[PDB]
Design a binder for these strands. Sequence first.
RNA 1: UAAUAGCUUCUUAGGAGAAUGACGUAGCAUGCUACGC
RNA 2: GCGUAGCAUGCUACGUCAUUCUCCUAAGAAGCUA
Lengths: 186, 185, 927, 75, 590
Amino acid sequence: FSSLPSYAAFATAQEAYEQAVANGDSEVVLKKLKKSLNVAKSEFDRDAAMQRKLEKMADQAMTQMYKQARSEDKRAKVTSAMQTMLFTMLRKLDNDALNNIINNARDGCVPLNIIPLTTAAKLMVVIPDYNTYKNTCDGTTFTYASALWEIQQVVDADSKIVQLSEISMDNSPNLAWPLIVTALRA
Amino acid sequence: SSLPSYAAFATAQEAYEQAVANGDSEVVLKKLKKSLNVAKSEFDRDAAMQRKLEKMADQAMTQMYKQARSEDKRAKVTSAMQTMLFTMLRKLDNDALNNIINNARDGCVPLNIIPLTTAAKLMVVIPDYNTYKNTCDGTTFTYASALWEIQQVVDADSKIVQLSEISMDNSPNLAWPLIVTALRA
Amino acid sequence: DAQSFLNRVCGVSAARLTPCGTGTSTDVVYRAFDIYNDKVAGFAKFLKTNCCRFQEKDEDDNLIDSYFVVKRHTFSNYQHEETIYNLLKDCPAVAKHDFFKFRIDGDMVPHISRQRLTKYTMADLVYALRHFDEGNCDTLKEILVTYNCCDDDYFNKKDWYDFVENPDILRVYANLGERVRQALLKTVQFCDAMRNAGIVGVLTLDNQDLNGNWYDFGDFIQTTPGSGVPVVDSYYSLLMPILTLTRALTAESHVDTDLTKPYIKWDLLKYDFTEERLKLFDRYFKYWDQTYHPNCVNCLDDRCILHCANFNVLFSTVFPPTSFGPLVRKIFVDGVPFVVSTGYHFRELGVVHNQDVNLHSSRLSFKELLVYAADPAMHAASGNLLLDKRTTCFSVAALTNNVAFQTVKPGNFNKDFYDFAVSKGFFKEGSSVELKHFFFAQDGNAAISDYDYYRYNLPTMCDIRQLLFVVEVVDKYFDCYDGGCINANQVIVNNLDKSAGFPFNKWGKARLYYDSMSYEDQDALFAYTKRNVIPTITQMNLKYAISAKNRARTVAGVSICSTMTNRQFHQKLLKSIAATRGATVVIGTSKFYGGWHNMLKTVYSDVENPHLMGWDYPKCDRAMPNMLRIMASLVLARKHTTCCSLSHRFYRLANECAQVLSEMVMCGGSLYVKPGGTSSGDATTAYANSVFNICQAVTANVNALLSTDGNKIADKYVRNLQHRLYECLYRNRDVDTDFVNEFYAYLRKHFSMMILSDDAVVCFNSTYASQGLVASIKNFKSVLYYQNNVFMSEAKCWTETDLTKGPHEFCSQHTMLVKQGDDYVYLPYPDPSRILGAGCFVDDIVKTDGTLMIERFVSLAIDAYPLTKHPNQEYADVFHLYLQYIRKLHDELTGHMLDMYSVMLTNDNTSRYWEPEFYEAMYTPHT
Amino acid sequence: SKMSDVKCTSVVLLSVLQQLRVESSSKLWAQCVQLHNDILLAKDTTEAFEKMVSLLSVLLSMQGAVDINKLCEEM
Amino acid sequence: AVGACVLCNSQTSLRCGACIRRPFLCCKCCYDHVISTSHKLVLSVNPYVCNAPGCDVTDVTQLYLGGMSYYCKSHKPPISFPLCANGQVFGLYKNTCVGSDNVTDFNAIATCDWTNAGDYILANTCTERLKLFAAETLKATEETFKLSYGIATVREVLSDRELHLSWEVGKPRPPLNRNYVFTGYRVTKNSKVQIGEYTFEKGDYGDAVVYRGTTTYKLNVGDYFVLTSHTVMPLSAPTLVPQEHYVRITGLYPTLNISDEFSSNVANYQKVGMQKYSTLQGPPGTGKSHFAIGLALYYPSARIVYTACSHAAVDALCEKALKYLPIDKCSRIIPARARVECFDKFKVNSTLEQYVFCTVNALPETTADIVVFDEISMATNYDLSVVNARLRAKHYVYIGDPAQLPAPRTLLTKGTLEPEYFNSVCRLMKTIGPDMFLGTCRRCPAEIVDTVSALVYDNKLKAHKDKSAQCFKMFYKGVITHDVSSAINRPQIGVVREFLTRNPAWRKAVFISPYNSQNAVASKILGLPTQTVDSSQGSEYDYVIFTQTTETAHSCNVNRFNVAITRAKVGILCIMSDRDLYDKLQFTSL
RNA sequence: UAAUAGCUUCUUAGGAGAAUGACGUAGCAUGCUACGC
RNA sequence: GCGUAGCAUGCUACGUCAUUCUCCUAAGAAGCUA
Ligand SMILES: [Mg+2]
Ligand SMILES: [Mg+2]
Ligand SMILES: [Zn+2]
Ligand SMILES: [Zn+2]
Ligand SMILES: [Zn+2]
Ligand SMILES: [Zn+2]
Ligand SMILES: [Zn+2]
């Protein structure tokens, strides 16, 4: 706008017009100078609108570039998080039993629903009432999934540890069922 | 509007009005008309920006008020909720609610949920003999607008105390606060 | 004499008989023939009058379940049936016939005597279960009692027939499983005997008594021996819904198929039961002449996926439930051993293997990382074994080391609005407008006790011959839309600040994944799902919303890996449905600016004697059978006749099943297996539900038309239509487009319908529905009973005989006819309790301020405007209460703003929100 | 207007109990939720008042969580 | 974000930018504050700077409000509006603010640097809000004074136990002791992150430190240390709760013949039960910390929280409770860092117990039935405000004596503070007198109480004991060695060593010295249990050694010497330097 | 922790179009006046 | 009669601004329904 020579042309035309008006020149010269100033300011406004459009387009392009940069930086963060999760879950795997069962497969393909059932080293049992507790995992060891599990901890709905001696028919109302008994394979 | 552009527009309008009041003819009239129009255009350009500025200011005022009220309401949320609860509880004026609240002000709070089924256990703590005299008469216990039968009274030492051991003179030797276990009647 | 007749009927067999008739005359009974001849067709309850029935009594003179049917007919039929029986005499599955000629009065009337039949036939059981009316169920009760399924006092229970209230009825029915299975075996023996004896004939249910013996040879023609053919299309197909209801094949889990011997211990590693399925099919459905592919990946089209999947539904109940689900395989990436799912074993679609399995890789692109972190193979393989005794559903693994118990908070009380309301005369004792909608709270056992409701989803084998025609009628209903695959750049997502499912919600909303993945690797993922199966976990989120009943509501958040591809696959069709006006499926039709009136006028499309009807689906999203969900997915996929190949469409269907129909469900930190039923969070949920609703309605019409007598249908066009409908169902294997069009036009003329995914208003013809030529409420009850395993109590189903009052309820909006301008229009008005409850109870503390939320009350008043024209003043006062509260809120907002500054707002257009005209303009058809 | 006044005070009371972290005590929170739901789904005023008494006894049982004197001396 | 004016509690959005705490101020009060002092920068929701493309003007009365921004005199738009005008300063809630005359002391509180004693005496005689703000900004000043210290670095590691020290050139070297901790840095290329929390303390030989750290990382030459700045948390509770008198005992229940030992304090127990809060004044060794435990035994059903600003005081209280109170119902809450070796004999960190012991700064937000604040003399208004904020209780009781040594107040370097202005409760003890008082020495030998009853106190304290002749006054010059900004007197330590083997019964004597440097460095030379006088407050010992390191105004303080000598129980050796202090007491000849 | 879809209300920003008003430039039609032929 | 010039009236094209309306997109808040 101001940097362009159109503004300089407008300024010099206005200065000439003011000097002529203060000098009281002839009316025809006044009209000629008014026409010159009009075309000068016409070119000025013609050039200015392009500047406004150009600066708005540059601003929206800068906003778009910032948005894309932020999205690209978020993609890398989510990729790193997913990789760390996948490799941590991999490292948590029980390699010996998993390899045994997968090799025993005829085609190398096994259903997912038997991977925990035959290779998990920890069992969590959620028990809603006392009769269920008596029937499924009474005592300190019990049988499930064709294995032998031993109790290592019993916690209630509050995740507050419960001793095995507190789980009685008369003390049942004083417990926060369900109890999440965590067992380990023997 | 008290704007210099408005002043120029006003003086052009006044000059044109005076001229047209004279209004002989015709070129001076047209020239003053064009002067009025060109001044009006400049004043209107100024006014448009004023209106846009006012709209932005109103948006700012509205957003700031919403944020301030929201943060204030998310801050005072516990005291406000408790005050509202007790105001509404006072408004109900139920005989049982008033009884239990007045008792809890004096320290005669229950130890577990007041049970509804008949012949169910209620345990309350009685802090002073004055509370025992008001609420307990004989073997009946007047609490929560119902009559309760006292099963066993214990002290802070978990020692059973007989109902004949409670009196105005023997109580100073007793270990207050008591704990009264009763069944609904 | 009538005694010589009894002596002759006794015959050489030492049988002691007591005549059920009266004086050597035919006994009249009301049986349930499956008949098709030159003048009548259908599976209806007729009145047979050609058989003299004698009942045999055992020792101590107790009447037993054995009858001597002594059918008499012409002499030529006598000779013909005697010859056909002589051919089939030695087959063990044939009731011992007795052909003699007894002088009834003065002439030799020839009788054939069937010896030791049961009272009812197989058709009576099939009809009593497929046409269940709890007010008149006397053959079902007698069949259940006479075969020791119950004790004749079991029916003194209030609702002994309800599946969702009395789940012991499943055991009571399953006590008939062995008898039904023995009937199937006897049918196969009889088919083999017909084949070897050179006898051509049709096998119908009403000719096999409940023991299994076959006794009707009237219409059997004999051809060259060794080349007879049994026509069993109508025998098996009608019997199909009974095979899973009674669990006829529960004796196949036992070694040597003996109900006393212990279960078969299949090796856990075994997942490919194709040979077992083939052996079962060749043992029970031997002469079912259409080819059966155990693995539906080999199928020919979606008409062959339905049939083979329907069989796989029945055959999957005898295989262990731990052999299904994803098939994992140990792949290596840069030498590190992954365990990933490279297949699937559907209960309906058989074994499906992925085609792009990379055993040795080195880098994982973002697409592959998303796929490997989406499928539950890693999560279940690295999680602790779980045994959740709170639910009967299968539990896979516990991801965390302790179970999460998620609660639901109570609502936040807007005390200012309540005080304002009671200052306006609201909430008085004895008032008609009272609070019924609240924010109900839930304990820690809410999410799991709500997930446990999937136990109402039972394996249902559908009537495949009838279903394969209902599908044609439904696809005719969906013939005005267009669909197909679109590029990732054409997919528009409404709200991207929404949860991404599990496990992706640990790192961002759906916006992060829709931004990170360029269009290229979204197209790559979509084209991956067309050649591979991606299992996916779906969370269960407790819904925090206001309702009138205290049951916990849960919604399933499907993983972004499933949502993106399902959007890209179905969005064109879904946006085509939402932009169509005046169709059957009114989705995308607003109720403002005259939308409700337009919808109601299009429903009354030139019906003759209109009565409005509406029904309810109890446990709609949980009791929906897997077969109907697969059918809905196939119907929505028929628009892909050019964009997708055959294998592409099958793998899209397999992904849909493995991600929505039966996938791993994350409920409180633990992976469970969803038995079936639609999840309420998949991409095409409302539209699939609309397809299922139309399917149920069309099935109800089909059953209503076929179950009518046929001798009572006066209109020669309707009787012919019933005849050709039976022909198109059970006598024609290819599609007949002419009759499909004719039946579609018939339904549109007499059963005009309006569907929004489970809300339906029907404007049927009352005269036809009374005569039985169009579905009524009872037909929907029967269809739901045998095809959803739920009982539809007639308390939630309404009927409106007067159209000046509109539908009783559609989309929870009652309809009233008001004078607007110069004419009468229908306006939808809500339940006032709902609007007041929305005003008083809010789900956020900042919505309790009021002055911050004036648009809330503007929207609520927009919804509550049509109450102004209600005749009940306590209803009309809700709108005025909201208007006055908006005025008060605006006044105190201006006061607070004037305090917080020293200047009032320059521009204030809030003055139009407490004038009734701004809201009256919302129901005027100009826009 | 007494029946509808109870149904709202139960909502406020359960909100207060939830803010006091009664939600962590599963056995007590189950009873509080049951009482709240039965108050909301009530047709008789006496039953609702008895259940409100039981539900408020939960708040009064914890002495130190609420300042009953300060709260009730503001009326 | 809006707030409340500090001295008027009116809604406002104006905060003084120049003030350390930036307190919310109403329009009138902000105008009076900026029109009076040198504070001229005010922070609204947006700061009051001039929003010209280039301009830096902060004086509010120089700026004008034009359009949507605040501009200076030479940049304002053609339509202008003053900010500071009409006796107010523009901000939210302009027409709802009522000012006050408290704008006079607030100016002094804000502007002053707390160096002179007048700031403290004007910060403790103002109202509740001004008392709170003055304490808040004083703690802010103390915390910000740490920003002027220096960054340390390591030269080499000849031995992994004796680390080498090196400070940044041109910055002061903070003293090396337990009070200061240092967190390392690895700013090289290459992990500009912290490497753990370490500490320093001078070694005897050369420049080496036997250091200590939470982790076991080894430092390269590139690693160096940075002192951790500590933020100042806000405070809103009153310094004192309003005292209300009850007609009879409320919330407390007595016992049946509590004990034959505490039966003399029953009237004061009733007095504590009667009032909302009470104050106990008692000279050292008169049973104040023995009164609180007697009250605890007098109210078994009452949940009691014992508190103290320091760690050694609550440790001694825990020891006395272990002696008297049942140990099953006990607790002791420790900060997670646990820099100082605390008292670990009960179930540590169990807030839900009946009798709870915890320092003030680590107090948990919980209730109680009576809280006994011990040794209020060491406590500041920040501490009282914190104890009234975190600990809501049915009864309060403050015990202590004005004559003991006050809180450190490190930046205070000019003049002396009178006892009555240490904190509000002490002023209450001095204005109308304490609520309870008991003057009778019960721990010290007769000789030392007879000598101290004339130094600070004017012949008031009687005792019940006999002068065991174990009181020795040692006279020596004590050459001065100023090593670590705290004076060390090596020859006095040597004379102590040479006069320890001739005292077979003095082998367990504790060494008491006002300067932490000598106290810490004496550990290797004598091996005796060591404890400075400031941390020795409230803890009694049967054998105590005191040495006056240097003749200064800090080491020869009358109150400090009194509180140091009153810890002895059967005998005390004092190495004294000042002739005046030496002559005033009457001990053995030596 | 908080799903898919539909519709509606409100606020803001941008773009396009339309209509009107004003200003300016260029072009065209008509009328009046000066000079030359 | 013509040309050059100036002024006045009218028409068209283009540019600028102001106002109003409509629509299309984007973002944000909210409500209802299945
Ligand atoms: Mg027959
Ligand atoms: Mg003490
Ligand atoms: Zn097939
Ligand atoms: Zn496609
Ligand atoms: Zn200041
Ligand atoms: Zn003020
Ligand atoms: Zn400036």
